[model samples]
Target: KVFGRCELAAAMKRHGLDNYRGYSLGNWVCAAKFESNFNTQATNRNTDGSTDYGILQINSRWWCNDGRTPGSRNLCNIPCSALLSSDITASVNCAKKIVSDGNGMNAWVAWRNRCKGTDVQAWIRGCRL
Candidate 1:
């Protein structure tokens, strides 16, 4: 499912992304835009052969078990394919775990490179939050 900025913002907020771990809702919105453009099934293959899955691009190497990554931790204990579902519950939950693990929003390079240290309120400007 492809989501609009405001639509994704609302969904993310419902799942507790609003200021979770001190990261603001706008931070999440901006990161998601840069990460996968809010495309639920988006996936990217890393140089290590692990894949980044779904909207937030959770990685197989440390989050989900893709059954192919050489030494995946599968910390989320879920199949990487689960992240592709339109539900987004598992993806958001796994993302919470990732951020809770001392990484904060730094877990996503897209956030660091594109969304971090910037005024991201514009990402959620039209969202009636």
Candidate 2:
């Protein structure tokens, strides 16, 4: 499902992304926008054969288990398919695990290249947090 900007923003906030690991709510909004455009079914295959899934594009390498990555850690202990559902509870929880792993938002290249050090607040403009 493709979520509206504010809809996804609100969902992330509701999932407790605000001030999560020192990242702002807008930071999450910006990352999700660039990562998947809030598309829950978004998947990106990597050269290493790992895949990214869901709105935040959690990777299969060290995050979710897709059952095919060469050295998948499945650190989140969840099936990669669970990330594709429109229900974002799993996605959000996995994201928390990612950041808490000490990578911060830097775990996501999209967040690093697009959202980092940018005017992220604009991503959440007009959304009543």
Candidate 3:
């Protein structure tokens, strides 16, 4: 999460997710920016009592199972901590599954609130890869 912007972009490209579902690399980068500021260890306790976790700030209430939390759809079949790891494989795969479910990138509030319908190509500026 503390990695450089270009570092993240490179890793994301290595995963072949630059333009997933017509979303540009900037979209993903901006998601990380508002979700966790690129910090993989990021976590936040919502006013509604739900906790969000990881770089994408995946919610424990729906996306993953953390045992103590309820209403866990666990649609990605992964533990919430899996998203906190340095390996983006589980997180990316899970996110892709969410998007593949017809949600598009709208699954993320960060995307909807910030990156949606905006010119965000600057998020990937200087990261040619």
Q: What does each candidate score in C-alpha RMSD?
A: 0.7, 0.8, 1.4
lDDT of 3: 0.83
Measured against the true structure, the TM-scores of the candidates, in listed sequence, are 0.97, 0.96, 0.91
Residue lDDT tens for model 2, 23-82 = 989999899989998899999999999999999999898888988999888899999999
Tell me the lDDT of model 3 at 32.
84
How far off is residue 127 in model 1, in Å?
1.4
- What TM-score quantifies how close candidate 3 is to the native fold? 0.91
Cα lDDT over the full model 1: 0.92
Which whole-number lDDT from 0 to 100 does residue 14 have in model 3? 83
Tens digit of per-residue lDDT, candidate 1, span 1-129:
999999989999999999999998999989889999999999999899899999999999999999999988989999999999999899999999999998699999999999899999888887787
Model 3 pairs in collision: none
User: How well does candidate 1 score on lDDT at residue 80?
Assistant: 92
Q: By summed lDDT, which 10 consecutive residues of candidate 1 come out lowest? A: 120-129
- What residue runs in model 2 are displaced by over 4 Å at the alpha carbon? none
Which regions in candidate 3 have their CA more than 4 angstroms from the true location?
none
Q: How well does candidate 3 score on lDDT at residue 89?
A: 82
When sorted by TM-score, best at the front, the candidate numbers are 1, 2, 3
**Higher-TM-score candidate of 2 and 3:** 2
The models' CA-based lDDT, in order, is 0.92, 0.91, 0.83
Misplaced by over 4 Å in model 1 are: none
